[PDB]
Design a protein around this ligand. Sequence first.
Ligand SMILES: Nc1ncnc2c1ncn2[C@@H]1O[C@H](COP(=O)(O)OP(=O)(O)O)[C@@H](O)[C@H]1O
Ligand code: ICS
Ligand code: CLF
Ligand code: CLF
Ligand code: ALF
Ligand SMILES: [Fe+3]
Ligand SMILES: [Fe+3]
Ligand SMILES: [Mg+2]
Lengths: 478, 522, 522, 274
Amino acid sequence: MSREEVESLIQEVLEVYPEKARKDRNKHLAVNDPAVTQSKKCIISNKKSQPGLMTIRGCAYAGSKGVVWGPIKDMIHISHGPVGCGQYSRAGRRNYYIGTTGVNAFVTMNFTSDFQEKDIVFGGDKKLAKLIDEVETLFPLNKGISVQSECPIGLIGDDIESVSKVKGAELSKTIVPVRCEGFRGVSQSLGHHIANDAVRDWVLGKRDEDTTFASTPYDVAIIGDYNIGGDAWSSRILLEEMGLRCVAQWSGDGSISEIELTPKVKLNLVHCYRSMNYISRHMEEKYGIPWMEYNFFGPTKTIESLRAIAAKFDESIQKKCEEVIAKYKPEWEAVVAKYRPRLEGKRVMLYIGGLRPRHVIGAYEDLGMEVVGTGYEFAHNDDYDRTMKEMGDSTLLYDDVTGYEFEEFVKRIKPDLIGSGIKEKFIFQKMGIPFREMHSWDYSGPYHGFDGFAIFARDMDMTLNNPCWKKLQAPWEA
Amino acid sequence: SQQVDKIKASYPLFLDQDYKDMLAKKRDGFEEKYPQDKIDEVFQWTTTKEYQELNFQREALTVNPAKACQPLGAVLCALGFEKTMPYVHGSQGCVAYFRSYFNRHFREPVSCVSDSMTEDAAVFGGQQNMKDGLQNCKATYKPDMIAVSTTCMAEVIGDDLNAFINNSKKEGFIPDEFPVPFAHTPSFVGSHVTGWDNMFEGIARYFTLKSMDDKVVGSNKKINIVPGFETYLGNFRVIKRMLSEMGVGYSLLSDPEEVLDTPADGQFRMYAGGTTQEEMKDAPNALNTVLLQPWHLEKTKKFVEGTWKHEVPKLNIPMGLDWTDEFLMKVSEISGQPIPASLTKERGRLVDMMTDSHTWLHGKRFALWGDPDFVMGLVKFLLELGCEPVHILCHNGNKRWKKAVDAILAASPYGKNATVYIGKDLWHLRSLVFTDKPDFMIGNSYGKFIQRDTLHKGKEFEVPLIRIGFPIFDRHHLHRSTTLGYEGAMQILTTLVNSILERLDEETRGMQATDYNHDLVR
Amino acid sequence: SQQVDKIKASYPLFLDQDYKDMLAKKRDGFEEKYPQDKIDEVFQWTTTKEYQELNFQREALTVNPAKACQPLGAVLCALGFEKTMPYVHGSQGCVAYFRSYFNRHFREPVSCVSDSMTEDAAVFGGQQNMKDGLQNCKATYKPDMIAVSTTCMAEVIGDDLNAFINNSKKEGFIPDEFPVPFAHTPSFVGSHVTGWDNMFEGIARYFTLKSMDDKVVGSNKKINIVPGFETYLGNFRVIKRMLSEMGVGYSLLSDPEEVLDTPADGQFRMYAGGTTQEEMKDAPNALNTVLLQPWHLEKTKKFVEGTWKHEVPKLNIPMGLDWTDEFLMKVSEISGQPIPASLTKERGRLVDMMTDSHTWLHGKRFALWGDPDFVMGLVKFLLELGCEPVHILCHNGNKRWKKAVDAILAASPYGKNATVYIGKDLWHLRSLVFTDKPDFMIGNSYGKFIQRDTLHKGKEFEVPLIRIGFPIFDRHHLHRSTTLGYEGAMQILTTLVNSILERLDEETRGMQATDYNHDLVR
Amino acid sequence: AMRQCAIYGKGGIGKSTTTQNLVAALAEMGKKVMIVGCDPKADSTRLILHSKAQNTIMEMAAEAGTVEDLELEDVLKAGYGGVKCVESGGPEPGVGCAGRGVITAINFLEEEGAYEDDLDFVFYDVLGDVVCGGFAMPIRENKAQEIYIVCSGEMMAMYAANNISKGIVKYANSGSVRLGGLICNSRNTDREDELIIALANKLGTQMIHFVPRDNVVQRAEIRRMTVIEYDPKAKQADEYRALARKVVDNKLLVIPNPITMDELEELLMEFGIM
Ligand SMILES: Nc1ncnc2c1ncn2[C@@H]1O[C@H](COP(=O)(O)OP(=O)(O)O)[C@@H](O)[C@H]1O
Ligand code: ICS
Ligand code: CLF
Ligand code: CLF
Ligand code: ALF
Ligand SMILES: [Fe+3]
Ligand SMILES: [Fe+3]
Ligand SMILES: [Mg+2]
């Protein structure tokens, strides 16, 4: 409450850090003021994490294998290096897909080279070639192989590009080497960039000299939607209900064929700007495909984005969009009339990776909920620039927040609901504050579109108004 | 569309006709996938014996490993000490993954820090990272001790942990007397259990190696208990309860049960319980040191025998009837206390349950996997019940462990059809349960996928999964169970017999088809 | 035909082609069976709402009752006493049935004798039967007490137990000082819980009615605990443990846990543990008497208030969170001991489990049945969890109990769709789960048949059974579980959430059909 | 007894050759020595074993599973004059990570008890380009106590010695490892001895026995032996005896104070002209 008190709270929280860490972290915490034109003066981001401060950030391998490459169904993604990274990343992210796992789809499988000491000392290129041969022998229906580098691969200079080229030529297979060793960058963001560059260099240009695909004027491709809990599907049904042909989905429930067919589309609808803006810009400046940011979180944002997308096509697409809006109006109106009274006036603080801390504010406000604090693990300056137009006045903004910082902010602010990842969930549940996992949707969802909105409102009410939160204090204590 | 009265999550939202039509159209138009007949043929081929031969000829590819990397076990070991912050020198993505893994298994907060070594730290070394990280962690989370492990990058470049910590102390980043035990935990060697062993050896030698002069064995009249990599809180609890019932003085080093089972009372406790530093300092004074899981405590065994001069007993993991008996008799012969009547009655009740359930247990075939000591204890207990552990897989097992388990199987008539695999992953085991089908499989949550695969070959080929081990992600509060001692054996027996009975109830639920055997009394 | 390597029991032996051919021929040629279409139509009719109306208009017919007769509960209560032989005056078939019932539930020996009243004893009375039976039982099984209940035949003919036992004593069949408490337990009144209440009141008034002058309330500084009809050994254990940790002196009257959980160590113990006679003699000296299950301890409550002069507190069964809190606070206010930190931490851990599992528990609909106190506690706990107990059946419940449960439901937002039925059997409940389908049903083993019936309507209509209550015949060692206290609430929560998760895993196990939601992490 | 020395210096400056000749001289004086080669080129024990040490710790470990399955007798082999010889293995150039191999080999030697009693000297011949912490494994705590840096009058050699001292500083402060002195291998440069002495004084150390450049060394080493085995009465053999004697009786163990690039250039102008 009040711009002054939250600034005082920030200073009091920073008081415990050593001078170097305090000086660094002061620039990553701010109080929102829409009177700011450039976020550079407001808040800086995408910088090194302070050591020993228990950051929430992942690595470039998480941003490449776990985020971008992993969701691709028909490709086999090999965690090149020791056993840990692939094992911890195995099916931790709910990028939903349709397929036969182990036969023609491999998303929840963990393929790894399982580096031993001799692989570090003498190199793993021969082992990588033998692994590719074994993948061919035992998984003959795979439609692509990606090699996601872990830390030792980047350290010891293994020439995974040479192996990829030779084996791909020998087997007529797309083998994509991704130099996503975890120590590169500062977070998953560089993993996104490296994965996008790998897609551009090894996949996107395979059908450049191909004209056997029939292209309709209403061709759009969903980019940066990873089908968490079926999100992309819930989004896709809306677009194709207003006449559009969804040629590609990036990359949740994604196939390598869709990525190859993406240059043939006419529009690129980007959901997560942060993760896939690189490839969106590349396709805009190479194939001339325009790309537009949209938002399918909540009825207001969904309707606004659907009308914005329709305005880029004929009158038929606009009429179909209007009929979709009119058709789905009673359902989300009923959802509001049921769950808004249960949630009106409730304060929410958010801390998610790089898109959702600002994208879901409209959905919460559709249920009368105010977002008082938000922040990102790995967002850039442009993300906070977009965030300012969405956050309310004098609301807390944090970048790469530490566990201590976020705990103290929650203690002082005392929100009704916290949306963050698995590493904050039980901490804040033990403080008696309802918590919703805003990465995995707490194993629920989707949250996109109107059906997603119904599920989102149900989950918000279920957790926020659960009786358990009234039982934290034993009755024999004051 | 959604009905506000009954809201469907993804299942069964995406079984609706419009969603099914959308998925079919997307597949037909843009996915270009193999024909369903081709997919069926390839699946049937993957369930065959020739595919299993190809699978077991693998030399370079690992598919669905049943193991993790050393720093995970190092973090778990460090978590078992009082007001101790786990600190992983290296890249922060590793720490994020370790924390997420343990959060999902325990459904509890898991505190761990990284010094966030980036590319510049990889090239120049993480000495500045170590100094700033130690100072920042101590100033921010106020631990009474920081336990340092490593990621793979710091081990490859040879980041000298000792030199880095010593320089941090001499330059005033952390107090000189602040305890910072360290252990090199290369992820490309061994597995998570090796990381636990390495971290414990480092913590032990930090507090004991330089002060052995004033130590005399037995002067505290206690018994050192080393649990090893343990993710069942009930196991710590049962070891403590059995030793305290016996009237035996004990010191359980690396006790994490309190920090992983904190209450929800409006307060977040970063630290709770754990082995105190004074306990580790006084550990050389113990009568003896007993290793609960000796097969991944080899370095600890060498250190304890060579430095503390304790004649560490040759005890298997206290799992099942015979090995719990041996553990109790060894503890008696060490401490001099007799086995009390309550423990004898608990053993007798275990035997009563065995006799009550032997008809359903006898002859049942099993595929199991996990860590070597847990796997060996499960094999021994299954032999005690008259079960057949046909497929015994241990990814992080070694030749000597395999020989010991083979000798255990040879000693029983129920180990005749049993084969022990080491260095094999869960894809090997999927092939094994397709080609030599057991009745059930026992393992962690990953085995669920194998069950799915078996159900695709048909209901008659489906191998149900019994969830015992680590990690268990798709069930709640199973980490509170017990597997050691008579109580752990009772819980395992109950789980096994009731899994068998629920499977039989499901297979006889068809009215007028199989319900003639849908007995009320089993 | 059989293969000596793989021998099939009845399932799946009778699925072989020759056996199927034989069964088809038998039915076709000699059974005159209704056509399959007629059977299907009648089943579908039985699953309908009109059939439910016809079902609920029943007045004379009971189908699949959810209760037993008084002498079963009398036998259990008598078993709860040291070296006590249960003795049922009447016909021996009743004793055979009681023993078989308890043997199948507990998988333990159940000692009980009959005086074997035949037609001549029915016509002339059981005086001679009582004399000879008391003599024979005392001489053969050497009990320190013989606790006498009745079968229905002895209650109809008015066999005056008091006169019979007195004449046995004065005629030298049994020693005059040998304790023979008696209770009239008419099987055509109430249910088994009423038999427990009657037997306990008889024993109490046998040991306390006459010798009340030298009794002063509170002089022993203990608390009387009356468990009532209880078939979960963990419930006795948890009440004992919570009172022991609390530093409260207690006297659990009718403690049968030892005699029902004897070890298998080469000898058979007919008697083990139990409430001593001195405990019942000194019971009037207690500070107060707490009834664990008050709703079938009404006669006991009247006796304790009117004879021992104890102001028996109004406590619900200590089930769930709120009622365990109330029980502990009342025990504190009585004994003066504070609630210790271990109990507070256990409560906090239960709350943590609730917060960990609320997303899967919330909104879940349940049909449940059992005894009134257990049912009420389950309803209260399910409301605490955010679940919906839509169908609440108590065959042996009464109007006042229904009022209390209705008031409990009205106090919670999750009781709006809940209905309480008393005097209804499991046929009513099968109709109920067909016409208003819950997600699960909680009850004893008989509910399995309802599950079978639901599966015949389809997989989407199947209501899985969660086995909590009495009796449980088709599972092993579930009688060892707990339902009272924080520990019982934790076990119930674990069972509920993991039943939900196993159901979801089964419903999402189809590859390329529903496995998109086959999540590793739940 | 049990003196642990680490031989460092500019690449190709003659660390292995001088180390082997010094070890031969020390072994002819009845001193029990062991040579550990921390170069993936297992060429630091050739003149002692009269052959290339085919068996190395890394190669044996890779062939025999892991390093734990190995035995000391399979990698620790005697040679001329009772000189035990072991070599850390390594990949072929341009692949793998040899520093990790050196770390693992030295850990294996420590764990297997290669540092027994009745061993007067343990000499770690390290490669010239210390590119990672792994090749600093010999100067870790409780591993090597004395550091001998071989240098010459060349500007590059002195710069490499100063850079190696800069790298040493962190281990010297962390532990008890010190700089014994600067062995000089003659390269026939103007004011070679003056340059080495001035650089040693600036570092805070001494120059230990400037060694002349003689082709008797080339001949002896081409005949697969040290000079002592080849020509004991040769001048260079007596020089290696003197070097061994000066190594035995050395007590100047200091933490180097390395000089910046500017001070190095001033040293070169002061003693590297005329
Ligand atoms: N005193 C010396 N006299 C003549 N040649 C020498 C002398 N010292 C070293 N060398 C020669 O210089 C070359 C350098 O090789 P080497 O000793 O292996 O250097 P390093 O071990 O530093 O890589 C060798 O061939 C060696 O014969
Ligand atoms: S890709 Fe990014 S952290 Fe844009 S790495 Fe992360 S499935 Fe988050 S806020 Mo987990 S930039 Fe997606 C994300 Fe957002 S894994 Fe998911 S939820 S919209
Ligand atoms: S930042 Fe990222 S997750 Fe970390 S290692 Fe690097 S790519 Fe991987 Fe891997 S095996 Fe274990 S978890 Fe690491 S210590 Fe190495
Ligand atoms: S000998 Fe036989 S089983 Fe006994 S009563 Fe008589 S017909 Fe029946 Fe019935 S309700 Fe209970 S079990 Fe009895 S006391 Fe009556
Ligand atoms: F070339 Al080298 F040690 F062999 F410097
Ligand atoms: Fe039994
Ligand atoms: Fe929790
Ligand atoms: Mg050399």
